[PDB]
């Protein structure tokens, strides 16, 4: 008797109580200290190498921990894997699929994942002694658009989807070990930790979900947001992540703190960013806007460090290095741009 | 140590280039076409025209020596609002809506939000809108025996007339063909909203007969990249 | 309506899973912020101005 | 967490007025494009109205146009529906959405259940 309107009402309770249990932990802020840290300035960035070898759109791409090779995806089925050191293409994959959303290079530089409407991943494979890459393993078990996907190792990876459920694979047997339920919009992205046991994933419901490896569960929400998270990316500390949603606001929020950080928002920015990733020190934060322009913020004082000019289309996909060397920013114009 | 390696891993990216420039060709040439709906509007019936020729998810096809390349999303979730970023290099999004689901639900207004979204998308702003009214002979019996009315969901139609543009065809009733025109022109009156000049919409009514529906795709698609590339050069 | 239930249902566990957990102040966690970065500030390449021969992008 | 309480909703007389406020707390009401639909028991979703991030273009169905009203107010971040001249079809659980794209005109919350920035509902019926 009376089942759903209690169960929602216990749930509202439940949530005002994460809220001020969160404000009671709120009795500061990350500005309380912006008279100790010094800021970084206008620092230009300049177009080092431009991979201008795509065809299509680059809507995907993930750097290696050799901070090499980089691979990006475009709309035409190609997946080209690039030597950024010499602008040169070291691999090209052909997909199975011409449109393609995700991108992730292995930790140890041999699998590649690719993905996007057709509902499935395609590992594949590139210290193979066969010569050309072939699809290594093909993982078909979700019912909504691979958004984005991130390697955990050359065993596990984990893949977000579009039917609210991430799912961790396993390239040894194929299939679905563990799944991340909860979400209530459609997940966009997702990053992982440098110690791998924990990985966030922000989706289009607003609230950053946080989850564990090992036993699969929601560890952390955060719902601070107020769009569609279209970025998430984890600090290289491991305690913190940013997020870049719809709304023209990044905000930044911590594991332990379970709340939000900082926003990273702007009176002269009304388009939504598509891409956020942090540096090798996590003080600036490469956010790749719908403005057609890639901004550098400080993660500590909360304002744009600088604008970058290149992309004449929406950049889609931003990928800094494992060591922070060379961040690329791979635009709608099939054009790569290698800023330093 | 310094071209060692180095001059294979060139040669390599040498190759690797003029495979891309040789798929380039087929690239451009190729034509996508988005192809979705508001639900069950008929795209099956599309689809299975198409040449003659792991579900059903896209299906390509060749008229006139131009390959074109149809995505169906019979699979995906309801929500749109992610996924179709991806077609902003699409050539056209033939939205195919059933003029006759709008009694079982009022899909006909959800159809008209849908296409209303696509029009004002910051990505879709420039991507043409291949608007066919499928399920048109369910249409007809439905707006004569009086079972389905336009009116039940459109206070519009009862202040609207058959404009001077009409299309009859033998053993058709004016009123079918003025519901028609009504719900062209409904999808018609969110085209000129923005009306921006980078795309417009092009209505087509077909599932009538099972005839060769891709002549209305192809002669669609070559008006299309004409008004592009007049617009791309300002000659329009 | 059973599945909104379950739904529900999942959605308070999930709650209540979250309420238990150990909150640090965000003071500690604007401190450990900072710490990382002045930890890493001299090592980073995108903050500090990297030498050309240093870079293998120049 | 972006929340949408919308308050009002009973018992109506068909032909008769009622008013729904719907207050959206989270975000910033005066730069989305707010909109009610309605899903009737036993079918989808129906797409009501939307409104502008002012109020300028302001749209209904068909099957409340000239009827309804809606209007948003950024003093307070509600947004107010009025229905008028109710039918026994208009019966039906009213969600107060919110499409996620800023200082736009597209909005996908035409969708099913299940939706990202959706209240649970007003179930507006229709008496005898």
């Known amino acids: 008797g009376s089942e759903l309107d209690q169960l929602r009402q216990e749930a509202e309770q439940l949530k005002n109580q994460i809220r001020d249990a969160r404000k009671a932990c709120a009795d500061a802020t990350l500005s309380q200290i912006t008279n100790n840290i010094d800021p970084v300035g206008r620092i230009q960035m300049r177009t080092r190498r431009t991979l201008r070898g795509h065809l299509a759109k680059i809507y995907a791409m993930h750097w290696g921990t050799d901070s090499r090779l980089l691979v990006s995806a475009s709309q035409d089925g190609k997946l080209i894997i690039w030597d950024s050191y010499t602008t040169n293409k070291v691999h090209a994959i052909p997909l199975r699929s011409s449109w393609v959303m995700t991108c992730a290079y292995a930790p140890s530089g041999n699998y590649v994942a690719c993905g996007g409407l057709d509902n499935i991943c395609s590992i594949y494979n590139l210290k193979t002694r066969e010569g050309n890459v072939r699809v290594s393993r093909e993982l078909a078990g979700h019912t909504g658009y691979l958004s984005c996907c991130r390697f955990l190792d050359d065993n596990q990876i984990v893949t977000s989807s579009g039917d609210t459920t991430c799912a961790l694979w396993d390239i040894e047997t194929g299939q679905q070990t563990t799944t991340f339920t909860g979400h209530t919009g459609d997940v966009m992205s997702l990053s992982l930790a440098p110690d791998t046991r924990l990985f966030v994933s922000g989706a289009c419901d607003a609230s950053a979900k946080l989850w564990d490896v090992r036993e699969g569960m929601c560890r952390q929400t955060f719902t601070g947001h107020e769009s569609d998270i279209n970025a998430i990316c984890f600090f290289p500390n491991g305690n913190a992540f940013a997020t870049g949603s719809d709304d023209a606001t990044c905000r930044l929020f911590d594991l332990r703190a379970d709340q939000e950080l900082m926003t990273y928002s702007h009176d002269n920015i009304i388009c939504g960013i598509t891409s956020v990733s942090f540096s090798k020190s996590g003080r600036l934060l490469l956010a790749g806007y719908d403005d057609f322009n890639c901004n550098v913020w400080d993660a500590l004082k909360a304002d744009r460090a600088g604008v970058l000019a290149g992309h004449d289309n929406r950049v889609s996909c931003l990928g800094v290095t494992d060591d922070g060397m060379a961040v690329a920013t791979g635009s709608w114009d099939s054009f790569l741009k290698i800023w330093n | 140590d310094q071209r060692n390696e180095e001059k294979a891993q060139r040669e390599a990216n040498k190759k690797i280039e003029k495979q891309l420039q040789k798929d380039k060709q087929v690239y451009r040439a190729t034509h996508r076409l988005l192809l979705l709906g508001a639900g069950e509007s008929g795209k099956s019936t599309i689809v299975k025209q198409m040449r003659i020729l792991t579900g059903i998810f896209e299906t390509k096809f060749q008229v006139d020596k131009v390959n074109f390349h149809m995505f169906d999303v019979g699979a995906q979730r309801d929500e749109r609002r992610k996924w179709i970023q991806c077609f902003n290099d699409v050539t056209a999004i033939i939205f195919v809506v059933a003029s006759s689901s709008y009694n079982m639900t009022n899909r006909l207004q959800e159809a008209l939000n849908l296409f209303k979204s696509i029009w004002n998308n910051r990505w879709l702003r420039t991507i043409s809108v291949i608007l066919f009214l499928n399920k048109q002979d369910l249409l007809a019996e439905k707006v004569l025996a009086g079972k389905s009315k336009i009116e039940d969901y459109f206070p519009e139609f009862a202040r609207y007339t058959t404009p001077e543009d009409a299309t009859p065809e033998p053993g058709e009733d004016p009123r079918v063909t003025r519901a028609k025109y009504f719900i062209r022109d409904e999808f018609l009156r969110i085209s000129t909203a923005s009306g921006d000049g980078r795309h417009y919409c092009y209505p087509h009514f077909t599932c009538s007969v099972d005839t060769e529906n891709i002549r209305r795709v192809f002669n669609d698609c070559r008006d299309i990249i004409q008004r592009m590339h007049l617009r791309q050069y300002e000659l329009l | 309506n059973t599945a909104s239930i379950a739904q529900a249902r999942k959605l308070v566990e999930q709650l209540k899973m979250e309420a238990n957990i150990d909150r640090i102040k965000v003071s500690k966690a604007a401190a450990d912020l900072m710490a990382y970065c002045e930890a890493h500030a001299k090592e980073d390449p995108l903050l500090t101005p990297v030498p050309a021969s240093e870079n293998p992008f120049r | 967490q972006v929340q949408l309480q919308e308050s009002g909703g009973g018992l109506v007389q068909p032909g008769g007025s009622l008013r729904l406020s719907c207050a959206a707390s989270?975000?910033?009401?005066?730069?989305?494009?707010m909109n009610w639909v309605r899903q009737a028991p036993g079918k989808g979703l129906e797409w009501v109205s939307d409104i502008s991030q002012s109020g300028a273009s302001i749209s209904y169905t068909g099957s409340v146009k000239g009827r309804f009203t809606i209007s948003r107010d950024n003093a307070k971040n509600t947004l107010y529906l009025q229905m008028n001249s109710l039918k026994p079809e208009d019966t039906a659980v009213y969600y107060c959405?919110?499409?996620?794209?800023?200082?736009?005109?597209?909005?996908?919350?035409?969708?099913?259940?299940?939706?990202?920035?959706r209240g649970q509902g007003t179930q507006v019926t229709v008496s005898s």
């Open positions: 989270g975000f910033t009401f005066s730069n989305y494009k």
């Open positions: 959405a919110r499409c996620p794209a800023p200082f736009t005109r597209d909005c996908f919350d035409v969708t099913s259940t299940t939706y990202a920035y």
